[PDB]
Design a protein around this ligand. Structure first.
Ligand SMILES: CC[C@@H](Oc1cccc(CN(CCCOc2ccc(OC)cc2)c2nc3ccccc3o2)c1)C(=O)O
Length: 268
């Protein structure tokens, strides 16, 4: 007459497989090297070729098209908006989340979504570049570094995080629980029912700890390593939000999608 924590871990994993269009298995199949192979974006010529095939509407304007850096900024936001939708549906599988007040659900997702985004982003990155456009492009790390300031500063810290995160060799069953734990942080600003959220967090972290013990018997410190990665992600998001605000204020053509503007509003 006890919680079945192995069953819960499997439920979370199944919800992750159902709700996220990208996962580490899918990404690795593509990155390894037959249908729909990824178009490689390594310079301005190949960026523009990729846009004409994969986001035609964005470049179907005359000399009215935006600057390449602003077009990339827009494409990045589009993926974030879609991933926020996936994360919101995923969160329903977390025991207790759907029993919280709506306002607390909103607050947890508001602070958690970009931590989860950058954790899952790691799965589509290697040291040379990253998958984009639902696995149909691969944009090189060096090309993103070549963009004009400040746009060249967006992705490189995420690559830095990812290279170390990927060295932990998590699989999707681990990542699903890590993303659930990110969402269940009881110390987010503005929460109403802190006590119930702390209990929800305790439960999901217990599931995560036991799962890592079973799935990674070789790495006895993997759980505290991941606790530290959660704190690293919070700092990564804080710095990212600061850069997004600089771009919003100084780049008149770089607009922010209204759903993301609300996420960023009063966040840090
Ligand atoms: C800039 C403001 C924006 O910052 C960022 C910063 C880093 C990452 C993102 C979201 N992201 C990159 C999409 C790039 O998308 C294209 C698409 C086409 C293209 O050219 C053809 C170029 C880039 C992403 N990928 C993922 C894959 C798996 C899981 C989660 C994922 O998250 C947004 C924000 O804050 O929303």
């Amino acid at each position: 007459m006890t919680a079945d924590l192995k069953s819960l871990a499997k439920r979370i994993y199944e919800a992750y497989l159902k709700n996220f269009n990208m996962n580490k298995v899918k990404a690795r199949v593509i990155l390894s090297g037959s249908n729909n192979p990824p178009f490689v974006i390594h310079d301005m010529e190949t960026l523009c070729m990729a846009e004409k095939t994969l986001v035609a509407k964005l470049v179907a304007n005359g000399i009215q098209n935006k600057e390449a850096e602003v077009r990339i900024f827009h494409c990045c936001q589009c993926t974030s908006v879609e991933t926020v939708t996936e994360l919101t549906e995923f969160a329903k599988a977390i025991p207790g989340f759907a029993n919280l007040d709506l306002n607390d659900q909103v607050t947890l997702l508001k602070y958690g979504v970009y931590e989860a985004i950058f954790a899952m982003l790691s799965s589509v990155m290697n040291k040379d570049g990253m998958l984009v456009a639902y696995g149909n492009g691969f944009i090189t790390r060096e090309f993103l570094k070549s963009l004009r300031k400040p746009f060249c500063d967006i992705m490189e810290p995420k690559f830095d995080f990812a290279m170390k995160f990927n060295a932990l060799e998590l699989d999707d069953s681990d990542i699903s629980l890590f993303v659930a734990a990110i969402i269940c942080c009881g110390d987010r600003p503005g929460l109403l029912n802190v006590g119930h959220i702390e209990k929800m967090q305790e439960g999901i972290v217990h599931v995560l700890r036991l799962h890592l013990q079973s799935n990674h018997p070789d790495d006895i410190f993997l759980f505290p390593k991941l606790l530290q990665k959660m704190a690293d992600l919070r700092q990564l998001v804080t710095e990212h939000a600061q850069l997004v605000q600089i771009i919003k204020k100084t780049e008149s053509d770089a607009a922010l999608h209204p759903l993301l503007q609300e996420i960023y509003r009063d966040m840090y």
